[PDB]
Each structure stands twice: as C-alpha cells, then as structure tokens.
C-alpha cells in the first residue's frame, strides 16, 4: 500500500510531519504530564475519519487506554467542530481499557481480529492509539529494567507488524519527565517531543524547526 497521512488538525504540526502521521509507521509522542499528548490522540481519532481532501483516510480507530483518559465527550466536541457527526465518529472508535501490561499485550492481538474484519470495508482501521504505552510497564517493572525492556520490545514489535501488515498508523504516547527516559529508544518509526510553551502554546520537535499549536474546541489547531 502507499503511505497514507493523517492530518493532526494543525497546519504547523502537519508541515513538521510532512503532511501528517503516516500509516505503516509508529509515531511516538513523548513529553511531561500535561504537555497535550492525549489531546493529540483525541484529535487524530477524529481527523482520521475525514476524507483525504480534508486530511483523513475515511478510517476506523482502535484505542487502547491504560490511564482512563479517553473522553467521549471530548471526541464529540472535536467532531462537532470538525464538521462531522459526533455519533458516527464515536461509533467508529473501538475502545478498550488495558488492566495491566500483560492485558495490554493481549489487546494488541485482539485488535488484529477487528482489523481483519474491517479490512475490505469502506471504513478499514487506519489508526491504532495506545495511550499510555509505557505506564503499566514502568509501574510493574520497577527495579527490573532488563525484563521491562524485553516485554516492551515484543509489544512494540507486535505494533510494528500491525502497522505494516494492515496499513495502519500506530500512535503511542509516553510520559517522560524529571530524570526519566529511555523514551522508547529507537523503536518508534518517528519520535515527537511535545512541551508546553508560554501562554498555553504547545511546541513539537522531531527527535532524530518546531511546530506550534493550541488546544481548542477543534482539538488542536494553529
Ligand atoms: O471491541 C474491541 C475493541 C478493542 C479496542 C482496542 C484494542 C482491542 C479491541 C478489541 C475488541 O474486540
């Protein structure tokens, strides 16, 4: 398949990304608590449902939530301010809460079944969100870094396989602050550092110019 792109909702961020986040790729956004990673996830879950003329892929979404941070009412607001019907947008987001890191790993295998079911339809899965990818692994493997890296490595390999095999954009978030960070090392296809700036602006930079955007009723925008 050709590489599809999903607009982030911000022209600035899209330019930094070459048009948007790519299918057949893992995009990892990392930054401190409150930097806007989950807002970007919510916005992408709407944008992907637009037609290509508007920066989407007419796609369905799957969302693995590890911190109970998915907000359907926020999806509704973004959809209504992106000219979509909020009920239809929510009906095309498959949502699951991961209880722990092992359940999170099983959910990726479960996601493949729904991906296969939708593959030949007019609304194939085009976006798989894992928010937060690292939170359970970090808490469960304190003092056991080598084992944590083994399990993360297989999890990321599973997500890669889905991205490439089924032409899906995988979008993952990773909280990194004071003294923390191996990030995801070199595993993601693309690493985006996100931070707060003056006056509530958010600033994004590719790791390995800078885009500036705001969080609004449209999700994010310039
Ligand atoms: O109904 C489902 C929703 C999911 C969401 C995320 C990952 C896997 C899922 C599997 C389902 O059957």
Alpha-carbon gap, residue 41 to 150, rounded angstroms: 26
The 10 Å Cβ neighbour count of residue 5 is 20
Q: 43: closest CA among 215, 222, 163, 176?
A: 215
| Cβ–Cβ under 8 Å, residues 28 and 17 | no
Contact of 169 with 49, CB cutoff 8 Å: no
Q: In what order do the strands lie in the sheet with 202-207?
A: 93-97, 60-65, 125-131, 169-175, 25-31, 190-196, 202-207, 211-216, 219-221
Of residues 10, 212, 7, 30, the one with CA closest to residue 130: 30
Cα angle 146, 194, 19; round to 5: 110
- Rounded-to-integer distance, Cα 41 and Cα 63, Å: 9
Residues with CB under 6 A from ligand 1: 62-64, 94-96, 107, 110-111, 114
Lookup: tokens for 77: 């607001």
- Pocket mutation for ligand 1, best pick of 41, 111, 155 (most atoms within 8 Å of C-beta): 111
Residue 135: how many other CB atoms lie within 10 Å: 18
CB neighbour burial string for 172-210, b if at least 16 within 10 angstroms, e if fewer? bbbbbeeeeeebbeebbbbbbbbbeeeeeebbbeeeeee
Cα(107) to ligand 1 centroid in Å equals 7
Contacts 24+ apart (CB under 8 A), 100-108: 100/136, 100/140, 101/136, 101/137, 101/140, 101/151, 101/155, 104/64, 104/66, 104/130, 104/136, 104/155, 105/151, 105/154, 105/155, 105/158, 107/64, 108/64, 108/155, 108/158, 108/159, 108/162
Atom of ligand 1 nearest to the CA of 96: 5
Experimental method: X-ray
State the distance from the centre of ligand 1 to the C-alpha of 206, rounded, in angstroms. 30
């Amino acid at each position: 398949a050709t590489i599809g792109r999903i607009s982030t909702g911000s022209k600035s961020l899209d330019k930094l990304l070459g048009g948007g986040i790519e299918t057949q790729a893992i995009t990892e956004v990392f930054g401190e608590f409150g930097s806007g990673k989950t807002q970007l996830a919510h916005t992408l879950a709407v944008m992907v449902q637009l037609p290509p003329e508007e920066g989407g892929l007419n796609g369905s979404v799957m969302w693995i939530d590890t911190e109970n941070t998915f907000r359907p009412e926020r999806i509704r607001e973004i959809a209504q301010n992106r000219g979509l019907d909020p009920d239809e947008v929510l009906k095309h987001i498959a949502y699951a809460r991961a209880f722990n890191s092992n359940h999170q790993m099983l959910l990726v295998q479960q996601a493949e079944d729904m991906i296969k079911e939708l593959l030949n339809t007019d609304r194939p899965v085009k976006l798989l969100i894992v928010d937060s990818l690292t939170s359970h692994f970090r808490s469960e493997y304190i003092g056991a870094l080598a084992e944590r890296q083994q399990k993360l490595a297989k999890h990321l390999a599973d997500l890669h396989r889905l991205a490439n095999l089924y032409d899906i954009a995988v979008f993952v978030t990773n909280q990194v602050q004071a003294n923390g960070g191996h990030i995801l090392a070199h595993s993601a296809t693309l690493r985006v550092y996100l931070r707060k700036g003056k006056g509530g602006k958010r600033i994004a930079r590719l790791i390995d110019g800078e885009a500036v955007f705001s969080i609004t009723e449209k999700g994010i925008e310039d």
